Design a protein around this ligand. Structure first.
Ligand SMILES: Nc1ncnc2c1ncn2[C@@H]1O[C@H](CSCC[C@H](N)C(=O)O)[C@@H](O)[C@H]1O
Ligand SMILES: Nc1ncnc2c1ncn2[C@@H]1O[C@H](CSCC[C@H](N)C(=O)O)[C@@H](O)[C@H]1O
Ligand SMILES: [Mg+2]
Ligand SMILES: [Mg+2]
Lengths: 219, 219
């Protein structure tokens, strides 16, 4: 439906201004054959505000892409704050690095290249946590296991956000053949069973396909 | 539409459990001849999570109705925490008081029966602030002025949430003659012009009509 796109433009015209660095991060996707699946401008503003509510000094992100979400959240940090972002595809990591450098965030953002499931245990061994806010936005089948590692890297009060857990309502389909839909359903079931967090799922509409984000606070 | 309602039920089954006090607050509406306009269960859980992220000890609410939103937020408070809620309709205030008593929240929730525009300057005279979180959800035309009073009762980092600021996308109609739509448009314009806060509007779908909430953090 057109109405959600029109209302998103109305909102971003008021409260979703994008500077050159964010517009250049979006423009970088097509040039590198990367999917146009960044958070929307209004979702970026929302993640920035959540980071401010957390008084975030240390943020962990799974799934960098071009660093669009990364720039929004890193801009909530104090100058001595750090965002670690994990990216499997070396092409995406190099594009994201250029975009972070253009944004003047080189000293605040560490891009680690590799599988999230390989790097998360390294972060625990290094004592990189606890993170004030964790954004889970990589491949979807392992969301459930990514959340278990996120808890190992959390403090009481840590906010864990997981993107793309509604998928146009396809999570209602118990017989879905789509691995990302199966991954979201398994993650959502895990969150429903979890005693370590208070959580909800926010349905989200706008310029992107109908979807949702899970928000979880570590008790 | 049906999909948004079905997905809302899926989410509330996982993460939106309502105890007897919440269900009794909902049931009180039809018995009392009150409009069925409480926040949804999943919106209630979201407000509770935001109050936890604020580490709220002092909460202000405009517009109590039967106290449904009030119960969700007051349950985030520590035992020495307080929520002040403003309700113009003495019948609504009496119904909310019974519902708050049933929830065991009598000691922590103060219902003030009168117009918010009359009571807000009383709270300033009393030094009742600052509030960690403010929920604006009363009559719609004066939302703009309620927000100015909310800033007078805020600290740096206060979260201000305003419900019902999208109204099924009717805020796109500059020629709307509906008081609630004009109130939302004027508030949204104020919010886009306001240099005292960082803010967004979240589009919302689910069991209620397509709408949205404004979220603002005081600088
Ligand atoms: N196993 C894995 N570990 C880490 N990153 C992975 C991964 N599998 C996929 N990814 C990456 O996850 C990303 C998902 S898109 C991330 C979008 C970004 N958070 C934004 O909103 O701007 C892609 O860059 C993809 O390459
Ligand atoms: N001037 C005013 N001052 C305070 N409350 C007002 C008001 N005008 C209307 N109201 C009240 O605002 C309420 C709007 S409905 C509030 C719903 C409630 N927050 C919930 O989600 O559960 C009604 O109870 C109405 O009586
Ligand atoms: Mg995503
Ligand atoms: Mg309302």
């Amino acid at each position: 439906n057109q109405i959600f796109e029109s209302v998103d433009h109305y909102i971003s015209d008021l409260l979703g201004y994008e500077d050159d660095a964010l517009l250049a991060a979006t423009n970088s996707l097509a040039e590198a054959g990367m999917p146009a699946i960044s958070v929307s401008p209004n979702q970026g503003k929302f993640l920035q505000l959540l980071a401010q509510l957390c008084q975030a000094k240390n943020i962990l992100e799974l799934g960098t892409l071009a660093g669009y979400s990364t720039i929004w959240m890193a801009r909530a940090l104090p100058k001595n704050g750090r965002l670690i972002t994990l990216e499997y595809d070396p092409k995406h990591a190099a594009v994201a690095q250029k975009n972070i450098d253009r944004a003047g965030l080189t000293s605040q953002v560490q891009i680690r290249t590799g599988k999230a499931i390989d790097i998360l245990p390294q972060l625990v061994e290094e004592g990189a946590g606890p993170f004030d806010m964790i954004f889970i936005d990589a491949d979807k089948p392992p969301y459930t296991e990514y959340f278990q590692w996120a808890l190992r890297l959390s403090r009481p009060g840590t906010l864990i956000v997981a993107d793309n857990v509604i998928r146009d309502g396809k999570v209602l389909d118990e017989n879905s053949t789509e691995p990302a839909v199966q991954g979201a359903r398994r993650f959502n079931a895990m969150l429903g069973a979890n005693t370590a967090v208070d959580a909800t799922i926010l349905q989200m509409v706008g310029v992107k396909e109908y979807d949702g984000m899970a928000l979880a606070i570590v008790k």
